[PDB]
Structure formats: C-alpha cells, structure tokens
Symmetry: C2
Subunit: 208 residues, 2 copies
C-alpha cells in the first residue's frame, strides 16, 4: 500500500548478472535511453547516502553522458502530482492517491536541455505517452532502461517494449529496487523472457 | 529457445494462495472469462495425464460452465500457425518460428457456439486483438483469467489489463506453468502488484 522504507543493499556484482538468452547488441544508431521515474519522491524511500543510491546515480550519469556523446536521445519519465482519480484508476487500490510533491528529477541526474521529458501514468512508460510513436518517428527500435523500481515499472516497460517490437536492454547496475532479491529477479525475468540485461560498461563500449 | 518438456507438478494447495492486497469482488454483470492459449501445441509440452493438466482442464470447465450459466462471456485466445516473421517479430529471437500445427483448443475445453475466439499475437491477450475495445463495448471491466503459462502470458495479460483499467482476477487453481515455482511466483506477483488471486470455488460463489 505504501512504498517501503528500503533497506540498504549492495549493487549486485557484474559476475552475478543472469546470462542473456538473446544476443542483441546496443546500436547507437537505433537506441534511446530511458531514465525511468528518477524523481525525488521515489528515491526518498531509500536512504540516499547508502548503497545502492550513490552508485545508481553515478551509473545513470555515466549512461546519459555516453548516450548524449553518441547522439542517443535521453528520455525521462516522471509521474505528475495530484493525479485525477479517473486517470489514476486502479493504481489507487494498490498504492494510494500517488505523489503530491517532489516531482522533480533528482538533481544529480537532472535533464539536459536537449533531453525529452514525458509525463508517466502507469507502470509501463508506453501507456498514455508518446514514447512508441516517437521511437517509430525517430526510427529507433532499442530502449536502454535505467532507474527505479526494477520489478514494477522497469519490468512492465520492458514487457510493452518487447511486445511492441522494441528491444529492451535493462542496465543491471543502473537500476534499483525494493530489495536485492527484487532487483535480481527483475534481471532474471527480463533476460530469460522479455529482453536483454547489460552492464554500464557494456553500454559504454557498445556506444563508445 | 524451445518450450521445455514441462515436468509434472502438484496443483498448489488453496491454503498457500497469496493474500490479496485489494478487495475487489468478482461481479457477474461486469466480468469476462478469458481462456488463455489452451491449445494442443502449448499443453502437449506437458504429460497431460499428470498434474497439473487434468485438474487444470477440469477447473477451466468448472469456470466456463458457471460463467455461461451467469451470462458471463467466455473469450478464448489462440496463436495461429505459421506466423509471418514480420508479425511475430521479437518472439522469434526467444522462442523460434512458433507453432506450425496443433492449433486447436484441446477437446476437453472446446469453445461453445456463443463463445468468442481471438487470434493471439503476443504474451498479452490485449495486443493486436479486439479484447480491450470489445470489453469497453460490453461495459465489462473485470477479466477472469485461466489457462497457460502463468509467468508468461497470464502475467502479461494481467499487467496489461490492470494498466488498461480492467481488473484482472487470476484463478490460481485454473492456470498452469513451467514449474510449481513459476506458478506460485506468478500468483505472488499478481496479488501484490497487479490484480487479484482467487480460487475456482470463489469464482463459482461470486457468480452463483
């Protein structure tokens, strides 16, 4: 009903990432980076000075910097404050009325002027946003996903993308979750059923 | 890459169903039963004489028969043979070219003349089908889900339904999966993040 006070946990070692079942490789000419719901509201459920938040933010910055250097668009999603109950619909039964403040992107990974920002309404970044038709317009069919929370919005976004013929790449050391278990199980599900799991360094070397 | 030979396992005990976080009640005036992908092709991956397939088929029949007695529409989904690779898209990377035969619903749960049958293209029964707009036409906003496989199509259909303002009810003893673990984890995920988990008897009692 409430997002938990998330206890600190260690970013999983890269050697523990689950093995990919598909062999897609991130292509700078075909990819978009999604910074998923990195709002103050959602990150304040962690103690930000503790693992995995400093590493998460540094890794998100590594991703977006390499992305912009390679001409890869960066898209941020953010939930709006004070959502109309008709618009929020069944989310209220699970999570309450939703955030009423602290909607800003956390300052460490604040958007740059050329980045795109979409208003998010559901777990999946494709529902009620321009994301799908804009990616088609840009003729980019790869979505590189960073942010929070792994087993909820990241997972659901990966599953629409996959079903919408967009290749999702979840960056395993650039997401965070309710627990190390939720984080890992997110990666195991994606790698075996819905997309690709890559490291920050694999993204960087793929996009130079 | 190939659907495994699925080892037999026991239907999970009713006392082990996860507790629901929401208090939705199945209403015969607002509900639809979805029989998800109960095709010979998908069920032949199991030894159908062993649990959980006999219980699955007679529980699906219990559900659909009480549904029709209550005026609840029954919708079946079925994948078509020899899918166009351009239409099948990224499924091919994970699973191969897909079924080429054995497309019929298994005779134990064969559709009745009044039931609806849709051609299915993705994990979620909502993608590239009329299901969402037909439910809106019928003014029914509850989807009671039975069939296979739990962590793949059942889960994705429930997530899509939830995000599309349709309440999903997954019938825990009328689905089956790759393993007892996948089956349970499907129910735990739905009950905590995406819908309601009910038993066959709870459905029967709810729709009289």
């Amino acid at each position: 009903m409430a997002i938990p006070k998330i206890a600190s946990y260690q970013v999983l070692p890269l050697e523990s990432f689950p093995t990919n079942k598909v062999d897609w490789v991130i292509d700078p000419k075909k990819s978009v980076v999604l910074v998923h719901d990195l709002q103050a509201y959602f990150l304040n459920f962690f103690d930000k000075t503790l693992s995995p938040v400093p590493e998460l933010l540094r890794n998100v910055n590594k991703v977006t910097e390499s992305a912009r250097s390679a001409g890869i668009p960066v898209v941020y999603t953010a939930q709006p404050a004070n959502q109309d109950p008709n618009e929020r619909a069944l989310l209220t039964d699970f999570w309450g009325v939703g955030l009423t403040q602290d909607t800003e992107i956390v300052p460490e990974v604040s958007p740059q002027p050329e980045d795109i920002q979409y208003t998010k309404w559901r777990y999946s970044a494709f529902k009620k946003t321009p994301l799908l038709e804009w990616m088609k317009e840009e003729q980019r069919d790869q979505l590189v996903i960073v942010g929070v929370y792994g087993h909820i919005g990241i997972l659901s976004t990966a599953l629409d993308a996959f079903m919408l013929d967009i290749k999702p790449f979840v960056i395993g050391d650039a997401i965070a979750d309710f627990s190390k278990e939720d984080h890992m199980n997110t990666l195991k599900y994606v790698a075996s059923r819905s997309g690709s799991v890559k490291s920050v360094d694999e993204f960087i070397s793929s996009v130079t």
